[PDB]
């Protein structure tokens, strides 16, 4: 057996979620970063 | 057989896709690094651009040094083979020393070749300096396809 | 805070390896039995969906690199919106690369015997599968990054005078050949991997 | 053969396919729609040809919406796991392909509605540049559904 | 250059196009073989210029009328590539125009000194350093009602950290020192903010001409404080910034510079700077060093130092435009071909 | 009692308070481009 | 076996972020679009009640939460299934994480859209044309996780 | 095995988060809107008693947070079930980082409302209704963890 | 169920009770001090009028110390894992609230106390914002004090 | 044995060092940032130089803190010692180090702000010190709470 | 048991500890006191012997670490008990990271006096009375090593 | 139990370490060189093959590590000690992350070098012994790495 | 048990350390002070082998590190106490990461002494006297190793 507590199903499911988490922390880090050209609203 | 267990070829293909993925992370910085300055020069002197395209084909002989290891190491495994552990972390290090090889490699021809050529608008007596130092940067790559290629021979 | 993070889940891995290595047991940290007992079909569908996945955010990188300067350089000469699409195209086929290997590699997808599970062969074609995808996507995310960025500087330059863009188009050329290696690798990596049995 | 975690990678793959599907959605319609709302301050009469980035956004939404309604149709208690890692699988392929196509739209769409205000040549060219992001979508659909079909055989 | 187009892609590709339109060497050879303002204006008019004096009908058609509406262009196409910025960018753009926003302080403050009509010398105020409380400053002569209640809200407020006012409220002699002084607080924060927040392509070659600004900054000031001033060079290091390639050393020998030949020994040891004080208008060498550094920061492509090296091209063409308009219309052409062309 | 532009008036309520320190009671009405009063 | 003891920990934590990561989303959509609002309603107070659409349709992901929510809760039992557990995992993070974009975009767009239509009063109706391209984003996260819980408990053991 | 051991710490670490990221979100709702307050009330100081109402709207999600904590804490004991602690972890999260969320809302649109409405008096009342579509989230999240709360001992074994 | 690895549990949360609200406490007394210290260089009068965030910030300190005594005397070596549980519990309730009350006292009383010298109206503003602010360490307090009163309550 | 385990020492040599540490961390951030301003306003004012110490002396005292409290761990440190003894020793030792740590921040931060201003008006120097008062405090509670601590780390273990 | 064959561990880590961080200390103290000086006396070089005193006293807190990092190194065996490796770690730590931070202190405190100390010839005796405020906080971690290192072997077994 | 089966990553990975890392030193120091001189032969022609100095030496860098990793390669055995791959690997992170060192200084010394010596032609000297400094770094880490490599298989055993 | 089969991974990464963590401060020591050499002497090359002094002194710790590293590998061994090897990682850990801050201490003192040496020509006396304190660092550490190699294989058995 690989382990009783970190066992093969458990560990592979960690590793899922994690590289999906990565991809939503990656993405949630583009759509943070997008901001407003405010010059092109206002009247000046 | 102790020697040779059964998850020996994942250590194989990561040699394959070492010697893949980063040769071409490499040959594709040490093109787009420096066609960002062959076209920096465009406009300025318009002339001098086919003769500068040396830092892009020795940027792209560094994919062909990742290309020639991936096949060998790709041609050494097979389902119905026995394929050691040695042999596995063997096909790991030659992808591993040649990924890392040709991306020093790609980002050394990246940083030379755009600047040389940028500067290669004002002085015209710059370019047998700048294919000198693009040559000691390009032969950076080719040590690591040596290393690979006599350690594929001594790993199979 | 992620450099916090990063030596932090650093110290947990030395404090646990070496508290598993100091007691006798560090043959229990056992990568070999991981990749023995987890299932080959993760490192199959996997491979597959990062092929497909890394293709395309590849293509859609330098997609938008030499989109939007194409669009910029198009404002004063709208005369290149049309020829120089080409750049759109070439950081476009690393896409249809990873569609052609992905569907390739699903076809060596089917379902496996659980007496023979865990075999030779049904393993070696996981990670055959799951490396071949991963090479082939990681490239042709490179390639279409690499793509738009000699893209982005042959929309300007053609911008500037009509007889750069063939000149700069060569860049995009030698930027190209890197997705179709990609393809060459990832098809002899999974060539002698047979199907799921 | 059918283990008890199973259906977690099934239903993390339905999730993934609309999650971050609307994540690139959402990007190609804010960053799109600053730019419509930028350029129509002073041309308003181009804002319904304008219109055209978020309306390829949201087809984007569509199909991952398509792909996670068609994961969740074959999820059960008792699945093995190859359904279970190949639902995974096309949840990924578009979620990582909706992500991307409407980050690309999204960055294409703003520059291409400003450059329209200016010269009017370039709505032609911001569709044309637009086409070959929207099927990015369709490149990650193809492997979603190609892979629900093999899902129970 | 591949996170650039994100933010950046549309601006730049303007911006490009905008250097197109910097006139060449050939552009400028057919604008001094001209006759007359109107010929002139009739060859600007095959450029990218063309039909800006369309509201003008060869009557009404001075030298100084040309330079108004070609800058003017300049403004507005700056007003329109600010506009699309957002982020970063327009922190940078509007880090371009705080340095226009403290001439034009320091040219509102002296037209109520000598009490001159707030009309008048407003219009010969720069556009792109305008605040909104920018006529609000004919309301006080001391500096300290000044800042206090005029310029504690615009962004020149944390630039007033060394001006002493002593009580003393204003002659012709400090409105130059706190110019001075605004500007070498200004370049200071400027350069940290390249060097913090603006990408490293874009960082070097920005660097390079923010201390080129400095280097001629601390010249003039080391040079036209032999003449018109009266200073201790405790008082005088106070006003030269401390960013570019002359302070460490030659900055130092600049203070103490009580002669010409305390500059140009100076001057002397520094090595893209020597020769500049030997023969030759001094004004022409630093214009033309000026465009030999923006000319190769164009060559660097994915940097938002083209916005920089732009506007500054931009108005050395405004200029040469200026002194050729001037030459054809009072009929001196012994100097027509002063201009500074590197495009 | 005067007219003013609708964007500067609080502007100028600023700039009356930090001249007057205090010492003053700003209303505005609104003028129904546009305007604004004050006293 | 099959439903062992850890399974309402997935259940539990799909019916938290279902209502946290919509919060997150109709937060800033009612923020980013709100100080719009408060910047654009001091010169012309006139259409302050016809800029609030933003802060509507960025709480109406709010109440595409607390439906799914509450729909998990009542569903969460002591000996469920783990089957029930990641299917309820599934649809508080499809919920969630695809509200928390549509408000994203609810955010930027409205404010982008309420400083644009007191200068150019045309605008308005292009704004609520793209705040409906960004509120069906939750509303399809909404379809998802509806047809996920009503496949959550229907043939377990 | 149904009732273990460690089964009380998701219960006291609930108790715990409910009133930790509702205090959060509460202190920041609390001082970027005081800021706002202490800034503009300088100019207009009849406005005090006026411009108070985002920092009460802020105190309003602590004390939803402290209804919470203050039920969770006496539904907790030891040898309760682990059903019972991921309930409570689940409820102490749902007002917590909801909470949360409502108070970055109510933080900073009462900032902007507050420099707003000392220049236009009709800006009030909107930024009143703007700051009750941010706090009806951590009501929301209230709402999710009282149902979430009512099944934590309901027909538990 | 009273294991040996209990009283952790309790060192902990009889740690972060004084610890994060020594935290709060310091950000609020820094804040409020630089405050001081810029606006009673012109205005000496008003200095011990001013005093008032730093005692604000003082009380959450105060807080913190009283449920870090509580729960150090009811710590033990053979308590259960529900006791430590709920010290912790109790501890982090009471530390990671008065941290971010002692961030809103000290953000609002620089902020005050920076405003207060120019408007004398403000200072009755200030304090009623600071009550808000200090509110948000009481409830931790409330939650802490009801967490222990029934760590040893029905415990085997 | 099960009580007394051989790993026990352990958490409290680590409460022994951290209780130095982190005070002498608090220490000289509050010796650091409150003397870059006695330092810079005596070179116009140096006869208030022996007065403007007290930012220093204060933050001094909190390393004095730090010290009692690592003494005391020290010497209850025993081979076959409890684990619950361990375990409140880290407890003391946190308790000393990290509310120190605060202290010291807030008298550094207070400190530089007070003797930068004190120079301009000189009744500010009752204020400041009032203000470092409680700033100091802040450690002084942790002292409190550690020296609490300590004399529960061997009262009825077994 | 009580004596581990991983026990000399933690006292190589201490031995090397200690000299580690008191190095890093003493080389920010020497480092930027050296820039103070070697930017102060270009003008006065008079004061060059006297504005030594930062480096000197940046330099004794690493003698503290060598004196601790020699007396755990002669009390280093093959078969010691853990509870002295556990001890000679703590000692290594109390030592390092205290050196550490007084070398902080000492290398700002000391630039901030030279800097200074060109201008008013009085601020030579504050800035000794600053870095002896400074240099007692290595001190202090010299005394807890050499009480704990005076017990890793005194009733071991 | 002595030559185990996982024995040869460790020497696998010390073969790759010193190609790895020593050409990433080597890329450092002929780029970043290479810049400076490409920027001071624009009015310096005659100085182009005088400038290539930093450049050869950062050469040499990679020559050292081509060198050791091959003299690795050609002891990687399938029935190898863990002794021999510890060896291998303590070789290889010796040459690579010493050459990594060499070739940071290489680069960050010949770029100032070749822009001073261009303005001043005596600086030259000054610049070569500032590199022979430099790349006795990387020599040292061959010089340990050879020691090293020598030991692995002296008395090996099982 | 008391040599296990691991025991000369310590040994190697501690062969293998005091050479890296060295080299790679000397190098730092190189650098930085060889741009404020070949950034001073365009004006006052006279001054070139008087200001590389510390060029040199950051050289001289690369000895100190390779010697330790010729001592820790010239005690290597298959069957080897574990003792051993936390002694050898000890001594490589000691000079490493000691002469990394030496080296620290010498670039960035040595290019603030070259620029300042140029303008007043007593300043020389105070950088020597300053960067011996800076290259003493290093040697403690050298001090550190030997005396612990000097315990490695003393009393030890198995």
């Known amino acids: 057996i690989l382990s009783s507590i970190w066992t093969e199903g458990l560990l592979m499911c960690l590793i899922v979620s994690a590289l999906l988490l990565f991809i939503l922390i990656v993405a949630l880090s583009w759509i943070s970063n997008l901001d407003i050209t405010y010059g092109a609203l206002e009247k000046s | 057989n102790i020697y040779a267990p059964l998850y020996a070829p994942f250590f194989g293909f990561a040699g394959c896709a070492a010697a893949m993925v980063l040769s071409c992370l490499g040959a594709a910085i040490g093109t787009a690094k420096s066609g960002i300055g062959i076209a920096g020069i465009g406009t300025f002197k318009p002339e001098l651009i086919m003769k500068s395209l040396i830092p892009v084909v020795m940027s792209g002989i560094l994919a062909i040094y990742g290309l020639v290891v991936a096949v060998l190491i790709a041609g050494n495994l097979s389902p119905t083979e026995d394929y050691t552990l040695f042999n596995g972390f063997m096909h790991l290090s030659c992808g591993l020393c040649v990924g890392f090889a040709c991306l020093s490699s790609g980002y050394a021809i990246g940083m030379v070749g755009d600047v040389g050529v940028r500067k290669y608008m004002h002085q015209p007596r710059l370019f047998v300096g700048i294919v000198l130092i693009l040559i000691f940067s390009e032969v950076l790559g080719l040590y690591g396809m040596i290393v690979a290629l006599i350690l594929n021979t001594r790993g199979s | ?168 188009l060569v860049i995009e050329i030698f930027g190209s050949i890197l997705g179709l290696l990609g393809l060459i690798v990832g098809l002899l990596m999974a060539g002698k991997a047979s199907e799921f049995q | 053969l059918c283990p008890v975690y199973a259906p977690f990678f099934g239903a993390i793959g339905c999730a993934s396919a609309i999650i971050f599907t609307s994540l690139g959605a959402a990007y190609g319609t804010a960053k799109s729609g600053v730019g419509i709302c930028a350029t129509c301050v002073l041309r308003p009469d181009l804002l319904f040809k304008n219109i055209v980035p978020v309306i390829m956004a949201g087809i984007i939404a569509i199909y991952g919406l398509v792909v996670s309604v068609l994961v969740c149709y074959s999820l059960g208690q008792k699945q093995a796991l190859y359904t279970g890692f190949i639902q995974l699988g096309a949840g990924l392929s578009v979620g990582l392909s909706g992500l991307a196509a409407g980050f690309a739209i999204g960055i294409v769409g703003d520059a291409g509605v400003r450059g329209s205000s200016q010269q009017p040549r370039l709505f032609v060219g911001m569709i044309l540049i637009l086409i070959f992001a929207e099927v990015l979508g369709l490149y990650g659909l193809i492997v979603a559904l190609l892979l629900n079909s093999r899902a129970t055989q | 250059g591949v996170y650039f187009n994100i933010d950046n892609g549309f601006i730049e590709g303007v911006v490009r196009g905008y250097r197109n339109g910097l006139l060449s060497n050939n552009q400028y050879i057919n604008l001094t073989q001209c006759d007359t303002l109107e010929d002139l204006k009739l060859q600007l008019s095959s450029t990218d210029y063309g039909n800006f004096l369309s509201s003008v009908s060869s009557e009404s058609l001075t030298t100084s009328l040309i330079q108004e509406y070609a800058s003017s262009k300049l403004y507005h196409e700056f007003n329109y590539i600010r506009d699309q910025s957002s982020g970063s960018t327009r922190k940078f753009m509007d880090y371009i125009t705080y340095g226009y926003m403290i001439d034009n302080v320091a040219l509102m403050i002296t037209g109520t000194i000598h009490d001159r009509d707030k009309g008048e010398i407003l219009q010969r105020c720069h556009p792109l350093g305008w605040f909104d409380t920018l006529p609000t400053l004919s309301v006080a002569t001391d500096l300290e009602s000044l800042y206090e209640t005029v310029l504690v809200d615009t962004p020149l407020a944390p630039y007033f950290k060394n001006c002493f006012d002593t009580a003393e409220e204003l002659d012709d002699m400090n409105i130059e020192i706190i110019r001075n002084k605004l500007y070498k607080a200004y370049l200071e924060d400027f350069y940290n903010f390249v060097t913090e927040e603006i990408p490293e392509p874009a960082k070097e070659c920005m660097q390079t001409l923010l201390g080129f600004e400095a280097d001629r900054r601390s010249i003039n000031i080391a040079l036209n404080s032999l003449q018109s001033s009266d200073i201790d060079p405790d008082l005088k290091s106070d006003l030269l910034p401390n960013i570019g390639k002359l302070y460490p050393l030659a900055t130092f020998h600049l203070a103490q510079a009580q002669d010409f030949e305390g500059v140009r020994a100076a001057l002397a040891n520094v090595y893209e700077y020597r020769g500049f004080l030997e023969t030759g208008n001094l004004e022409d060498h630093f214009y033309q060093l000026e465009m030999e550094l923006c000319r190769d920061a164009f060559t660097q492509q994915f940097a938002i130092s083209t916005v920089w090296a732009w506007m500054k091209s931009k108005e050395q063409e405004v200029r040469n435009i200026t002194w050729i308009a001037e030459c054809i219309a009072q009929n001196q052409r012994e100097r027509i071909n002063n201009y500074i062309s590197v495009y | 009692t005067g007219s003013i532009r609708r964007t500067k008036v609080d502007i100028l309520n600023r700039i009356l308070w930090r001249l007057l320190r205090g010492n003053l009671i700003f209303q505005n009405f609104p003028i129904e481009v546009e305007k604004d009063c004050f006293i």
Not at chain 3, 36 to 60: D, E, F, H, K
Not at chain 3, 75 to 92: G, H
Request: with cysteine; proline share 1%.
């Open chain 3, 1 to 168: 805070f992620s450099h916090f993070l990063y030596y932090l889940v650093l110290i947990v891995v030395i404090v646990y390896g070496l508290y598993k290595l100091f007691t006798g047991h560090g043959s229990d940290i056992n990568f070999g039995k991981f990749l023995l007992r987890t299932s080959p079909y993760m490192w199959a569908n996997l491979g597959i969906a990062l092929c497909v996945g890394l293709s395309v955010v590849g293509a859609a990188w330098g997609i938008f690199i030499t989109g939007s300067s194409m669009i910029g350089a198009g404002v004063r000469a709208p005369r290149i919106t049309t020829k120089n699409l080409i750049s759109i195209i070439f950081c476009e086929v690393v896409a249809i690369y990873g569609l052609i290997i992905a569907i390739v590699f699903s076809s060596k997808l089917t379902v496996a015997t659980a007496e023979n599970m865990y075999s030779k062969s049904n393993l070696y074609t996981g990670y055959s599968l799951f490396w071949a995808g991963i090479t082939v996507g990681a490239s042709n995310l490179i390639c279409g990054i690499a793509v738009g960025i000699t893209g982005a500087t042959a929309a300007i330059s053609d911008a500037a005078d009509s007889a750069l863009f063939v000149k700069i």
